Amino acid sequence: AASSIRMQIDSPEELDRLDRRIIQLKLEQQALMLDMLNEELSDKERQYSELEEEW
Amino acid sequence: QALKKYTIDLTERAEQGKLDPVIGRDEEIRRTIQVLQRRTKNNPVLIGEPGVGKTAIVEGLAQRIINGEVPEGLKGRRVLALDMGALVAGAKYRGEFEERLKGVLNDLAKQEGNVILFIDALHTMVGAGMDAGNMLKPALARGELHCVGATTLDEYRQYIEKDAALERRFQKVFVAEPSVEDTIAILRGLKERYELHHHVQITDPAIVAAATLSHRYIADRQLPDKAIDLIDEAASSIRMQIDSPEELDRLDRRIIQLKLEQQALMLDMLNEELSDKERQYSELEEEWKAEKASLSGTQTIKAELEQAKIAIEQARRVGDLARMSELQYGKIPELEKQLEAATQLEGKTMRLLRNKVTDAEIAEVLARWTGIPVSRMMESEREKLLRMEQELHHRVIGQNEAVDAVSNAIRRSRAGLADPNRPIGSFLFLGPTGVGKTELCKALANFMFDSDEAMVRIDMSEFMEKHSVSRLVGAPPGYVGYEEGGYLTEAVRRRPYSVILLDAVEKAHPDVFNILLQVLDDGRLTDGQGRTVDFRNTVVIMTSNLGSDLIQERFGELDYAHMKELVLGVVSHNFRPEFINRIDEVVVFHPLGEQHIASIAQIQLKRLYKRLEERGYEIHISDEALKLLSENGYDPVYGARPLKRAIQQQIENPLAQQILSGELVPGKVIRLEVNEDRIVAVQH
Amino acid sequence: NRPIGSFLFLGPTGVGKTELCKALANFMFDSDEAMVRIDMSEFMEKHSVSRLVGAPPGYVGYEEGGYLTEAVRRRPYSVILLDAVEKAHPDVFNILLQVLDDGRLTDGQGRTVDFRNTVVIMTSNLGSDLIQERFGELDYAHMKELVLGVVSHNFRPEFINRIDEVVVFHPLGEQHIASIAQIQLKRLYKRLEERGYE
Amino acid sequence: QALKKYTIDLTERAEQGKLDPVIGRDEEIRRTIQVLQRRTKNNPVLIGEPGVGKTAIVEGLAQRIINGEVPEGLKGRRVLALDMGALVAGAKYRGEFEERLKGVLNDLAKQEGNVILFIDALHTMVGAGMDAGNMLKPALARGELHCVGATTLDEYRQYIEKDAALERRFQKVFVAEPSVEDTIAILRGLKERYELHHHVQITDPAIVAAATLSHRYIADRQLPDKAIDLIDEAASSIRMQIDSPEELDRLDRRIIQLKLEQQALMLDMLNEELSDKERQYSELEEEWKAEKASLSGTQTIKAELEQAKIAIEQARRVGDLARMSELQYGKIPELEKQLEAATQLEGKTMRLLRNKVTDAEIAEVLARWESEREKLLRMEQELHHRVIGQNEAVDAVSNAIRRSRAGLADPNRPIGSFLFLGPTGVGKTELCKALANFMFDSDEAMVRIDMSEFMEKHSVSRLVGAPPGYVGYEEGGYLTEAVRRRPYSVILLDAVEKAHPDVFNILLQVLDDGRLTDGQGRTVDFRNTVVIMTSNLGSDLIQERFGELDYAHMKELVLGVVSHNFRPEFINRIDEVVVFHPLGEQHIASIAQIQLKRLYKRLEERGYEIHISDEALKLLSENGYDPVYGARPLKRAIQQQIENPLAQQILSGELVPGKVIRLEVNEDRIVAVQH
Amino acid sequence: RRFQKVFVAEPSVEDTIAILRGLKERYELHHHVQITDPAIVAAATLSHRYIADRQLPDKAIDLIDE
Amino acid sequence: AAAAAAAAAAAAAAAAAAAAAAAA
Ligand SMILES: Nc1ncnc2c1ncn2[C@@H]1O[C@H](COP(=O)(O)OP(=O)(O)OP(O)(O)=S)[C@@H](O)[C@H]1O
Ligand SMILES: Nc1ncnc2c1ncn2[C@@H]1O[C@H](COP(=O)(O)OP(=O)(O)OP(O)(O)=S)[C@@H](O)[C@H]1O
Ligand SMILES: Nc1ncnc2c1ncn2[C@@H]1O[C@H](COP(=O)(O)OP(=O)(O)OP(O)(O)=S)[C@@H](O)[C@H]1O
Ligand SMILES: Nc1ncnc2c1ncn2[C@@H]1O[C@H](COP(=O)(O)OP(=O)(O)OP(O)(O)=S)[C@@H](O)[C@H]1O
């Protein structure tokens, strides 16, 4: 259980949610080069950076 | 160095993408990571039945390492699977294997937790030709080694729990035998892999049928492996049945036959017929080449789609920006839509060449792998079932009850309506003596396998003692005939589809009925060595003549039902009642009338004519002789065998008497005429 | 110091008795094969305790262990059925009274195994003629009392009073029949779905 | 040199005095010397159960060779011992055991008739893989080897009667079991060795008491070995108790805790308290050092006493004249008397403590790994600790027990021979249980036999024992295993009147012989057990006529009834038939009260404080009471009518552990309250 | 589990006959003789009938070669 | 250098017995 919680220390999961989201929208905006996705990407990257610094 | 000279990087083939997409089993990978970062009992060891992707679970660890799904402390590590056989070979001089192995030890010490070792079949590390266990066991019992074990449960009992000096280094990391639906998901991912190599397409109902019918029928192999092999084999079956046609063979033999005929005749007309059929041959041949070209373009562009997926995973690891979006939104949708265009074009053009694996492909593969009629009903089987009822009336006149019973049983077998919790025909026969009981069982054997004695005729007239279970089942270990196995375990575990016949079961000593309980409840049987034996594709007919006096007393003036219940009570007196209700249906025979024995006389006379053809003689009987035989070879008390004796005597004694005189010449039809009492053979 | 299960289940056959034992296994013992099926119908003979329990040898059920006590030595966490207690003998009640008082039970081999982690169930059919007859328009408690009087006619009442409770299983008339036939129809539908039929 | 690889020079060890000065057994040693100076068949074997010191017999023979007490064929020989397990365990392949075995024979011939061999585990040498006996066959036969066996009688009859060369290339020398007094003299010889090793002294009455209790409370181990183990482990325990101490640990933890407290406080008072406790700890410490110095001097003077004894034995071997009288008459009495001065000095000064190991230490070692007679003086009180009433039967049974452990009558006749009558349920079986309990050990550590069953010839064949080659064989009769596994128990015979009268013959053989021959050819004794026969023949005769009718005449009346029933030979051998009258309603009510006591004990095991109305107790005692059966219907009826509604209310979520739970009456039943 | 069983069957009666016909041509290469077709049906019939120990088509070849 | 020499490897197997009652 100690090593299990240690694995939980070396997680999180919403980081992966937001990272797949930002790389997916980065793929989309790189294709679209209407957009709105610069702003969506900026919001999600700020959220990801905040949660990352919290981590 | 020697790591590069004797180990195998699993993570390199993970980097090279050669390894299998390990799907499922996430929980055990997690528990493996848990055990890996544990101070004491540091080295995990994998425990399971063989065939369950233990090596694949270690490679799935490697997958999550390269993809970075692991924790950060295990990122950038190394997984080097050491080859024993590389270590063994070149050590020609003394202590070179010692020298090599100690150098590997020193380099592993130098790597300092970066490299994580994995050597399965851990007994080989226990000794590799002093040699390896006494050399590595220091690094084991010092904690410098961070290895991972993987074994079968057999070595976990033998070569692991015996040395309790290795106990506090390990952990029962038990892998369970996986279930049906995880095998289905695994097969979806491995369909996506496997259709590259076999160049075919696989239907998903065929996949769930592979899982279902693999789990139901075989027992020696387990999930996931048996269904995967059914996929791989039936894909090869599709590959072969595409790889050469059959109508081309029909027309090619036709045109070479007409070619030989036309060249022999040199009226003609055969130049014209040969030219038309050669045109047909060339047309179907060129169509065959064009459709094979369709296979070629379709599968090559499918492989290009797969390489696009692999390269975009490479870009996911590396992190290019325009290459990711370029490869995805350019390469994927266009190759997908033109692969679907080639797929619907094959749906247009593939005529003789069904490249999509149906479930019937899987069923035919399974049938020819186990023995059961798993293949779908060719209509030879349907007419064979018409023949089932009829041909049972051929080699057995009379006794229509068990005829119907066995007919219904194999009918409920073939249509899938059987019960996979029990063996198919759990029959018990009864009645008076000599009335076609063993005949009916040989009649089934003649039906099902076209062989009179191809049936396991275990005879319950040997088993009148306690130790006779050790005759038929097998022997417990350490003792005499232990390595030879019994008889029933052999003759079932080879071919699970036969007519297990238990001749005269009342004479066996009543502990053997315990084995019959396990049969006629479960159909898996604890043999003496340790394992089990599936019976649920067999038919267990048991014969006896318990209520002989009762049935020969009262088959007249009684129904079938209360006669059945009355002899049923007799059986209740003789067996265990725990046995008798684990039966499909007791059938009740009865003796024969004159027409029955007259028909049997026709049967035996036809096989007698079959015999005397081989000596070279042919006989047309007087019809009056039928009356004398039916008067002679008849009694209700003793059934049929006085007919065999009467025909044998009254025919073949003067017949053989006069054959050995050299008197009866081959060439004449021997009219067996009669005197007032006897049979007189004539020569005209 | 009494064992967990002490049960006489009265009623006709068919009726879920073995199914009740397996459901009791299914939730108390949480599995199917936590049971040992032994009828007492085979034990009208004088050598019931020998083959059942363990004996001075010369027999068969010695190197096997035995029928009952040594299978509890195999399965100490189990449920015991005893069908057909009307087929009894003096070396049936007495072994069972040692069970009812003790749980630990003297075999032939001399190694008693406790029964206080297990469930002992008996069944019979003695007053089940009356159960087949008059379950309709009669209650449950007075029927249970009258059939317990019937068992007191058949058995010694000092035997049948160490049991926890003797209950009655009624004949399953209509909807039980419809339900269980529907179960077999649905598993038939399931296997023909495996074939591909509706 | 496999002699260096596999053998032990015991002559070297006893020559260096490493070994036991083994005492006694001189006849058997002499017969071994007889065997060892033959021309052929020059090999004795030793037959006895292990732990009788056959090894030590060979050891004492070797010490006699060191002494040179031997005739003129043995002076100068070297006795060497050998295992077979040291040879079998290295058999990887074919021919690796046997290279060792032949190299052994090459060393044996190499020493040229000078070495006497010892080999124990002879029955081991039978089986190793032909394997072992055939290579030793010539040297065992041709006089070129002087092997000495050591094994057990069962292994002799199992193994050594098979190979005839294994028979007559050896010779039997019977090894007996040592007596009580000879064990005492042995331990007297072994006392000084122990007192040298464990640095302490030993009470010699505790030695003979250790011998008594070793025979008494131990069945498996035997002599010398079990008393060796007792005295060694007790001496080690006493040596640990001396070589510690507890009050010093308490005082040391106290002074360091008050030291930390005074260091934290820097009102005080704690410098003064700390100085007082340090002074007391120093007093205890100096007493401890004075005791250890006294025991050090005692052990040194004891070891010098033993060295003087070894020196006077060396003078007996060599033959110095004035050294004998000098060492004896000077060194022995003065060192013994100042060793006794040290003994009384350490009896004075060991306080916190003893060194002389007493028999209570033996009781510790024994019961871990003495009021018997006086409890038997109050044995009637013991029996009425648990069972109320039937005083006369208690008295007569206590009379029989006093005659038994006092040992007046025939010891070949069994202890308890008692037929019991009257109606059951009053506690006859309860009397049996408590009788075996306070008599010997336990309530149900007994044997119960259902003699209601056995009515025919095959029934006798059951309980007696089936003859061989028949049905019920390999675990004896019903009776025979039950007693042979239970050497000290009580036999119970219920419903003796239901039996066929032939089993009474088996009972008569019991009462005369006490050894009883089964079908398995072995007699299982009953002389250390109690037979209890029970019946109920004159039940109604007592129930109708207990009122103001005495014990003796009613006993004689129902005895005449039994004379109408049973054999005159059978009632001849009866010690006494007690009455077992129905007691009363209040005494059976009191037995129900004791059932309520164990009930409340189990409720307190659950943890409930539950009380009762005494009227509720009267209703209980009137629920299931019957004169026809006794208290057992009352027992089960009260048990049901309590356990069902009470635990019904408990599982109804009503009863709380820790409330006033008075079992108040209903109109006919009992309700519990919550207050 | 590193393999696949391929259950080679015991060959039947008439299949043994055809096998013997091809090998009849081969032994008429070697042993300088002629072979009749009743010899073929006799070798099949007899090896299936009398002997028990060995199996088709090994023992029919035993007969023909001998 | 030397060669891995061949061995001898003595092995063994066992027997049960069987005892048989009489009915009467
Ligand atoms: N989770 C899985 N995902 C994909 N394929 C799997 C999975 N588990 C098993 N397999 C397949 O089953 C095979 C079993 O390989 P192995 O690891 O060698 O078998 P094993 O069951 O681990 O036992 P051994 O002794 O190594 S044969 C794999 O190579 C795959 O083909
Ligand atoms: N309806 C039938 N048609 C043809 N032959 C039959 C028929 N009934 C009986 N026979 C003959 O009866 C004989 C039966 O042999 P068995 O099967 O051993 O005897 P059984 O009557 O089936 O039972 P047992 O084992 O002899 S007591 C054979 O020779 C059959 O030819
Ligand atoms: N009330 C019921 N609910 C469900 N199934 C029932 C019910 N009553 C009877 N059955 C079924 O009746 C069928 C008869 O099979 P059995 O269970 O062997 O007979 P029964 O339950 O056992 O009574 P016994 O003890 O065997 S005589 C089974 O399928 C039972 O599940
Ligand atoms: N004559 C004796 N004088 C003193 N002690 C003796 C004598 N005979 C036997 N003993 C004791 O018996 C003890 C038993 O030890 P062992 O010699 O091992 O027993 P054993 O009788 O040889 O049987 P095994 O097989 O060796 S256990 C020895 O330690 C002796 O002290």
mmCIF file with all atom_site columns, all heavy atoms in Angstrom, chain B residues 96-109:
data_model
loop_
_atom_site.group_PDB
_atom_site.id
_atom_site.type_symbol
_atom_site.label_atom_id
_atom_site.label_alt_id
_atom_site.label_comp_id
_atom_site.label_asym_id
_atom_site.label_entity_id
_atom_site.label_seq_id
_atom_site.pdbx_PDB_ins_code
_atom_site.Cartn_x
_atom_site.Cartn_y
_atom_site.Cartn_z
_atom_site.occupancy
_atom_site.B_iso_or_equiv
_atom_site.pdbx_formal_charge
_atom_site.auth_seq_id
_atom_site.auth_comp_id
_atom_site.auth_asym_id
_atom_site.auth_atom_id
_atom_site.pdbx_PDB_model_num
ATOM 1   N N   . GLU B 1 96  ? 34.948 -19.808 -17.813 1.00 0.00 ? 96  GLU B N   1
ATOM 2   C CA  . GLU B 1 96  ? 34.631 -18.683 -18.678 1.00 0.00 ? 96  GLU B CA  1
ATOM 3   C C   . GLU B 1 96  ? 33.199 -18.228 -18.450 1.00 0.00 ? 96  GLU B C   1
ATOM 4   O O   . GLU B 1 96  ? 32.915 -17.024 -18.451 1.00 0.00 ? 96  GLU B O   1
ATOM 5   C CB  . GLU B 1 96  ? 34.850 -19.071 -20.135 1.00 0.00 ? 96  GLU B CB  1
ATOM 6   C CG  . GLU B 1 96  ? 36.221 -19.649 -20.422 1.00 0.00 ? 96  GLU B CG  1
ATOM 7   C CD  . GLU B 1 96  ? 37.356 -18.676 -20.193 1.00 0.00 ? 96  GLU B CD  1
ATOM 8   O OE1 . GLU B 1 96  ? 37.175 -17.469 -20.450 1.00 0.00 ? 96  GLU B OE1 1
ATOM 9   O OE2 . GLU B 1 96  ? 38.435 -19.123 -19.748 1.00 0.00 ? 96  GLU B OE2 1
ATOM 10  N N   . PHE B 1 97  ? 32.291 -19.187 -18.250 1.00 0.00 ? 97  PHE B N   1
ATOM 11  C CA  . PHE B 1 97  ? 30.923 -18.868 -17.860 1.00 0.00 ? 97  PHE B CA  1
ATOM 12  C C   . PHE B 1 97  ? 30.893 -18.180 -16.509 1.00 0.00 ? 97  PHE B C   1
ATOM 13  O O   . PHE B 1 97  ? 30.067 -17.291 -16.271 1.00 0.00 ? 97  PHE B O   1
ATOM 14  C CB  . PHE B 1 97  ? 30.084 -20.143 -17.815 1.00 0.00 ? 97  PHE B CB  1
ATOM 15  C CG  . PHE B 1 97  ? 28.662 -19.911 -17.419 1.00 0.00 ? 97  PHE B CG  1
ATOM 16  C CD1 . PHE B 1 97  ? 27.768 -19.358 -18.317 1.00 0.00 ? 97  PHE B CD1 1
ATOM 17  C CD2 . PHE B 1 97  ? 28.219 -20.244 -16.151 1.00 0.00 ? 97  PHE B CD2 1
ATOM 18  C CE1 . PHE B 1 97  ? 26.459 -19.140 -17.961 1.00 0.00 ? 97  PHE B CE1 1
ATOM 19  C CE2 . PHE B 1 97  ? 26.911 -20.026 -15.792 1.00 0.00 ? 97  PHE B CE2 1
ATOM 20  C CZ  . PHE B 1 97  ? 26.030 -19.473 -16.697 1.00 0.00 ? 97  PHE B CZ  1
ATOM 21  N N   . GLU B 1 98  ? 31.783 -18.596 -15.611 1.00 0.00 ? 98  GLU B N   1
ATOM 22  C CA  . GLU B 1 98  ? 32.003 -17.866 -14.374 1.00 0.00 ? 98  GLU B CA  1
ATOM 23  C C   . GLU B 1 98  ? 32.489 -16.457 -14.665 1.00 0.00 ? 98  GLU B C   1
ATOM 24  O O   . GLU B 1 98  ? 31.986 -15.487 -14.088 1.00 0.00 ? 98  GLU B O   1
ATOM 25  C CB  . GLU B 1 98  ? 33.032 -18.607 -13.533 1.00 0.00 ? 98  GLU B CB  1
ATOM 26  C CG  . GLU B 1 98  ? 32.655 -20.028 -13.212 1.00 0.00 ? 98  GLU B CG  1
ATOM 27  C CD  . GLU B 1 98  ? 33.778 -20.768 -12.520 1.00 0.00 ? 98  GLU B CD  1
ATOM 28  O OE1 . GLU B 1 98  ? 34.885 -20.202 -12.419 1.00 0.00 ? 98  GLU B OE1 1
ATOM 29  O OE2 . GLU B 1 98  ? 33.560 -21.913 -12.081 1.00 0.00 ? 98  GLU B OE2 1
ATOM 30  N N   . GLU B 1 99  ? 33.438 -16.336 -15.592 1.00 0.00 ? 99  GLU B N   1
ATOM 31  C CA  . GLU B 1 99  ? 34.018 -15.046 -15.933 1.00 0.00 ? 99  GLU B CA  1
ATOM 32  C C   . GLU B 1 99  ? 33.004 -14.142 -16.615 1.00 0.00 ? 99  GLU B C   1
ATOM 33  O O   . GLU B 1 99  ? 32.869 -12.965 -16.256 1.00 0.00 ? 99  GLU B O   1
ATOM 34  C CB  . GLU B 1 99  ? 35.226 -15.269 -16.832 1.00 0.00 ? 99  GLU B CB  1
ATOM 35  C CG  . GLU B 1 99  ? 35.904 -14.017 -17.301 1.00 0.00 ? 99  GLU B CG  1
ATOM 36  C CD  . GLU B 1 99  ? 37.124 -14.333 -18.129 1.00 0.00 ? 99  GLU B CD  1
ATOM 37  O OE1 . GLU B 1 99  ? 37.414 -15.535 -18.307 1.00 0.00 ? 99  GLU B OE1 1
ATOM 38  O OE2 . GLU B 1 99  ? 37.790 -13.390 -18.603 1.00 0.00 ? 99  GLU B OE2 1
ATOM 39  N N   . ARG B 1 100 ? 32.282 -14.691 -17.598 1.00 0.00 ? 100 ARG B N   1
ATOM 40  C CA  . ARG B 1 100 ? 31.213 -13.959 -18.267 1.00 0.00 ? 100 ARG B CA  1
ATOM 41  C C   . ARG B 1 100 ? 30.143 -13.525 -17.289 1.00 0.00 ? 100 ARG B C   1
ATOM 42  O O   . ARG B 1 100 ? 29.694 -12.373 -17.312 1.00 0.00 ? 100 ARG B O   1
ATOM 43  C CB  . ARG B 1 100 ? 30.570 -14.834 -19.337 1.00 0.00 ? 100 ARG B CB  1
ATOM 44  C CG  . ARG B 1 100 ? 31.381 -15.035 -20.571 1.00 0.00 ? 100 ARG B CG  1
ATOM 45  C CD  . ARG B 1 100 ? 30.661 -15.979 -21.502 1.00 0.00 ? 100 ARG B CD  1
ATOM 46  N NE  . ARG B 1 100 ? 31.354 -16.061 -22.776 1.00 0.00 ? 100 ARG B NE  1
ATOM 47  C CZ  . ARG B 1 100 ? 31.010 -16.863 -23.774 1.00 0.00 ? 100 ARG B CZ  1
ATOM 48  N NH1 . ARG B 1 100 ? 29.971 -17.681 -23.656 1.00 0.00 ? 100 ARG B NH1 1
ATOM 49  N NH2 . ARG B 1 100 ? 31.716 -16.839 -24.894 1.00 0.00 ? 100 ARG B NH2 1
ATOM 50  N N   . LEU B 1 101 ? 29.748 -14.429 -16.406 1.00 0.00 ? 101 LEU B N   1
ATOM 51  C CA  . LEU B 1 101 ? 28.634 -14.159 -15.523 1.00 0.00 ? 101 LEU B CA  1
ATOM 52  C C   . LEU B 1 101 ? 29.010 -13.134 -14.470 1.00 0.00 ? 101 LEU B C   1
ATOM 53  O O   . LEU B 1 101 ? 28.212 -12.254 -14.131 1.00 0.00 ? 101 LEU B O   1
ATOM 54  C CB  . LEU B 1 101 ? 28.187 -15.467 -14.896 1.00 0.00 ? 101 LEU B CB  1
ATOM 55  C CG  . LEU B 1 101 ? 26.910 -15.411 -14.096 1.00 0.00 ? 101 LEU B CG  1
ATOM 56  C CD1 . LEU B 1 101 ? 25.829 -14.823 -14.977 1.00 0.00 ? 101 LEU B CD1 1
ATOM 57  C CD2 . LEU B 1 101 ? 26.584 -16.835 -13.749 1.00 0.00 ? 101 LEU B CD2 1
ATOM 58  N N   . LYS B 1 102 ? 30.249 -13.199 -13.991 1.00 0.00 ? 102 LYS B N   1
ATOM 59  C CA  . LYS B 1 102 ? 30.723 -12.212 -13.038 1.00 0.00 ? 102 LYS B CA  1
ATOM 60  C C   . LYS B 1 102 ? 30.929 -10.858 -13.698 1.00 0.00 ? 102 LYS B C   1
ATOM 61  O O   . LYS B 1 102 ? 30.718 -9.826  -13.059 1.00 0.00 ? 102 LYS B O   1
ATOM 62  C CB  . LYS B 1 102 ? 32.014 -12.709 -12.398 1.00 0.00 ? 102 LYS B CB  1
ATOM 63  C CG  . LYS B 1 102 ? 32.490 -11.866 -11.250 1.00 0.00 ? 102 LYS B CG  1
ATOM 64  C CD  . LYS B 1 102 ? 33.703 -12.478 -10.606 1.00 0.00 ? 102 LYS B CD  1
ATOM 65  C CE  . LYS B 1 102 ? 34.180 -11.621 -9.455  1.00 0.00 ? 102 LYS B CE  1
ATOM 66  N NZ  . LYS B 1 102 ? 35.382 -12.200 -8.799  1.00 0.00 ? 102 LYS B NZ  1
ATOM 67  N N   . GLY B 1 103 ? 31.313 -10.835 -14.976 1.00 0.00 ? 103 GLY B N   1
ATOM 68  C CA  . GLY B 1 103 ? 31.376 -9.568  -15.685 1.00 0.00 ? 103 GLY B CA  1
ATOM 69  C C   . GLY B 1 103 ? 30.009 -8.942  -15.878 1.00 0.00 ? 103 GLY B C   1
ATOM 70  O O   . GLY B 1 103 ? 29.854 -7.722  -15.775 1.00 0.00 ? 103 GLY B O   1
ATOM 71  N N   . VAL B 1 104 ? 29.001 -9.774  -16.153 1.00 0.00 ? 104 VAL B N   1
ATOM 72  C CA  . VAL B 1 104 ? 27.620 -9.301  -16.229 1.00 0.00 ? 104 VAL B CA  1
ATOM 73  C C   . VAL B 1 104 ? 27.169 -8.763  -14.885 1.00 0.00 ? 104 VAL B C   1
ATOM 74  O O   . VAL B 1 104 ? 26.508 -7.720  -14.799 1.00 0.00 ? 104 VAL B O   1
ATOM 75  C CB  . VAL B 1 104 ? 26.708 -10.440 -16.718 1.00 0.00 ? 104 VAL B CB  1
ATOM 76  C CG1 . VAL B 1 104 ? 25.244 -10.086 -16.558 1.00 0.00 ? 104 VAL B CG1 1
ATOM 77  C CG2 . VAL B 1 104 ? 26.996 -10.725 -18.168 1.00 0.00 ? 104 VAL B CG2 1
ATOM 78  N N   . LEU B 1 105 ? 27.553 -9.461  -13.818 1.00 0.00 ? 105 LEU B N   1
ATOM 79  C CA  . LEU B 1 105 ? 27.315 -9.001  -12.459 1.00 0.00 ? 105 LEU B CA  1
ATOM 80  C C   . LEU B 1 105 ? 27.942 -7.640  -12.205 1.00 0.00 ? 105 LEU B C   1
ATOM 81  O O   . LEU B 1 105 ? 27.304 -6.749  -11.633 1.00 0.00 ? 105 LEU B O   1
ATOM 82  C CB  . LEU B 1 105 ? 27.885 -10.032 -11.494 1.00 0.00 ? 105 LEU B CB  1
ATOM 83  C CG  . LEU B 1 105 ? 27.882 -9.691  -10.016 1.00 0.00 ? 105 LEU B CG  1
ATOM 84  C CD1 . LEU B 1 105 ? 26.460 -9.567  -9.509  1.00 0.00 ? 105 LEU B CD1 1
ATOM 85  C CD2 . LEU B 1 105 ? 28.659 -10.752 -9.254  1.00 0.00 ? 105 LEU B CD2 1
ATOM 86  N N   . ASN B 1 106 ? 29.177 -7.452  -12.661 1.00 0.00 ? 106 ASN B N   1
ATOM 87  C CA  . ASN B 1 106 ? 29.882 -6.202  -12.412 1.00 0.00 ? 106 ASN B CA  1
ATOM 88  C C   . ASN B 1 106 ? 29.280 -5.061  -13.214 1.00 0.00 ? 106 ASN B C   1
ATOM 89  O O   . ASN B 1 106 ? 29.165 -3.936  -12.716 1.00 0.00 ? 106 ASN B O   1
ATOM 90  C CB  . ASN B 1 106 ? 31.356 -6.375  -12.751 1.00 0.00 ? 106 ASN B CB  1
ATOM 91  C CG  . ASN B 1 106 ? 32.040 -7.348  -11.828 1.00 0.00 ? 106 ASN B CG  1
ATOM 92  O OD1 . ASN B 1 106 ? 31.829 -7.323  -10.619 1.00 0.00 ? 106 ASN B OD1 1
ATOM 93  N ND2 . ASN B 1 106 ? 32.835 -8.244  -12.399 1.00 0.00 ? 106 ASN B ND2 1
ATOM 94  N N   . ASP B 1 107 ? 28.867 -5.340  -14.446 1.00 0.00 ? 107 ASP B N   1
ATOM 95  C CA  . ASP B 1 107 ? 28.259 -4.303  -15.267 1.00 0.00 ? 107 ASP B CA  1
ATOM 96  C C   . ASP B 1 107 ? 26.881 -3.931  -14.740 1.00 0.00 ? 107 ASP B C   1
ATOM 97  O O   . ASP B 1 107 ? 26.498 -2.753  -14.750 1.00 0.00 ? 107 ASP B O   1
ATOM 98  C CB  . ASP B 1 107 ? 28.184 -4.775  -16.715 1.00 0.00 ? 107 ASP B CB  1
ATOM 99  C CG  . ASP B 1 107 ? 29.556 -4.969  -17.328 1.00 0.00 ? 107 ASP B CG  1
ATOM 100 O OD1 . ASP B 1 107 ? 30.506 -4.299  -16.871 1.00 0.00 ? 107 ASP B OD1 1
ATOM 101 O OD2 . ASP B 1 107 ? 29.690 -5.786  -18.264 1.00 0.00 ? 107 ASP B OD2 1
ATOM 102 N N   . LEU B 1 108 ? 26.141 -4.925  -14.246 1.00 0.00 ? 108 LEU B N   1
ATOM 103 C CA  . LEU B 1 108 ? 24.854 -4.666  -13.621 1.00 0.00 ? 108 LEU B CA  1
ATOM 104 C C   . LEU B 1 108 ? 25.026 -3.865  -12.343 1.00 0.00 ? 108 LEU B C   1
ATOM 105 O O   . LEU B 1 108 ? 24.178 -3.033  -12.004 1.00 0.00 ? 108 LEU B O   1
ATOM 106 C CB  . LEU B 1 108 ? 24.153 -5.996  -13.355 1.00 0.00 ? 108 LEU B CB  1
ATOM 107 C CG  . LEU B 1 108 ? 22.708 -6.000  -12.863 1.00 0.00 ? 108 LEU B CG  1
ATOM 108 C CD1 . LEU B 1 108 ? 21.995 -7.174  -13.489 1.00 0.00 ? 108 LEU B CD1 1
ATOM 109 C CD2 . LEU B 1 108 ? 22.608 -6.110  -11.341 1.00 0.00 ? 108 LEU B CD2 1
ATOM 110 N N   . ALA B 1 109 ? 26.117 -4.109  -11.620 1.00 0.00 ? 109 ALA B N   1
ATOM 111 C CA  . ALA B 1 109 ? 26.437 -3.274  -10.474 1.00 0.00 ? 109 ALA B CA  1
ATOM 112 C C   . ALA B 1 109 ? 26.776 -1.859  -10.907 1.00 0.00 ? 109 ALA B C   1
ATOM 113 O O   . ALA B 1 109 ? 26.414 -0.902  -10.220 1.00 0.00 ? 109 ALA B O   1
ATOM 114 C CB  . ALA B 1 109 ? 27.599 -3.881  -9.694  1.00 0.00 ? 109 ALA B CB  1
#
